[PDB]
Amino acid sequence: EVLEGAGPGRLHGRLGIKPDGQPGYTRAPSPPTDLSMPQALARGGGFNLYLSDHLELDRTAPDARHASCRQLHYDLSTLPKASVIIVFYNEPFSTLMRSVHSVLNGTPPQILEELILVDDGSTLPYIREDGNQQLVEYLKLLPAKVRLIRNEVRKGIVGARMKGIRASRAPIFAILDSHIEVSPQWLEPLLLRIKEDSRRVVMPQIDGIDAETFKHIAGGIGCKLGFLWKLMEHSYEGHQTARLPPEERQPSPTDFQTSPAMAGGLFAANKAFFFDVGAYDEDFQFWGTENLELSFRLWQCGGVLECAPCSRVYHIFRKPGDSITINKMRTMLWMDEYADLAWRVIGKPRVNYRPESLEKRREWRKRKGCKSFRWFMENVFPEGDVVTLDDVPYLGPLRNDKIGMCLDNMGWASPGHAVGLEYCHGGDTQTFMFFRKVGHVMPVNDDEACLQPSGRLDWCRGTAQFWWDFTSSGQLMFRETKQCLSAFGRKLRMVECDDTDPYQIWSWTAYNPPDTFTFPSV
């Protein structure tokens, strides 16, 4: 069928009904009262499955859109249809079908070309062809524009996303996850934007669904996402926003904003431009970091990445082999000399990043004319703490020569733990960086953990409570209190600064990286 009794809140008709008037899906009782939340979170793969199975598929959500988003009007006839692609692997029936229902009930059929369901080699009895046919038989109860396609073997996100993209028909495709619910008028703002310029990749903002209670919650994250040298998307910090031009430190919720990085895999894009700009790096293995490789390459090769604060999508906040490291390595091909820093932050890994295929990627980058990563930093993300590698002047052991020991993260680069003094051994547990633009002293393996006068590590904040100065005589001076740290007594205490005190004079290797990153041999 095409449509079956439409209406507001159910734009594609009454979904999932049998030819007898009864829902083709039997909701489950209320979850048991004696429910061990940690064990039920497992059963569901990161969320309360008992509760999900008790909630309706036609679950109505709150309108997360700012008020000024509803005063916008869209002429649905002058908009181009789009193909929504939902990849999934072993996603439970209740959350997958609730995603489909949410889309169909919250998308005008006039602008929705199709809803592509990509089975990435699932093994659950209700998905498989050789199973009980629950999914397949339930789809017959949905509009015909809902299509299912399969992968013999699980290929990962990059592999599954491409399968649906290549299969789509609309000029524009929208990627969503398998555990989502939409706010009203979520697709209209994206289509209007990609219509005026096909080089635009537009991200809907992300709200959340609690893993344990399914309560709808505001994402809170802004629009602009930077990145951490651990190669992870990272929302602009307050001091990073302060570096924006005044006209953009607090823009209206209705206007689109550029973002250096993508929050996940949730976006829309004109199909033709998507392939012209490189699509995905199909040699990325399973899941991880494809979103950064897409953002860097997109900006560098004549594209634009934008958010849409008037396009909200709820997304369950849930509570791999050597693949995740391989992915990061390949991403560094787009980072040029900065790869030297990122390589050390992830621990100078030595894997098989599939070099022969990565070279073919580098010739493509050259043949396309993509800009450099230096341009990327100076033009797309100049608000970062490291815009040029000269902003990392020190990277090495922090040694106090008098006691013959150097600092040690104590196996804990993560924030919250006290730092020790240990005999130097040249390992990554004893190396530290310096970000001069913010006065931060961090272990190389975690640029989110910053040293404090307390002697401990803590989450970095671009403020006075984390600003250090490395003096000409080797003192580590906390700028706020004008005190210098000492190794006296194999203990880290703050004292009065005196270049004569040998316990407060330190050595810090200078970070003078090469102008070109040479990938490690395999």
Residue numbers in the entry: 100 to 418, 426 to 628
Q: What does the study report here?
A:
To examine the role of Mn2+N in catalysis, we first verified its presence by solving the x-ray crystal structure of apo TxgGalNAc-T3 in the absence of Mn2+ to 2.9 Å resolution and did not observe density for Mn2+N. We initially hypothesized that Mn2+N was aligning the sidechains for GalNAc binding. However, a comparison of the substrate-bound structure and apo structure shows that the Mn2+N binding residues adopt similar conformations in both structures, indicating that Mn2+N uses an alternate mechanism to influence activity. Loop II is disordered in the apo structure and becomes more ordered upon peptide substrate binding.
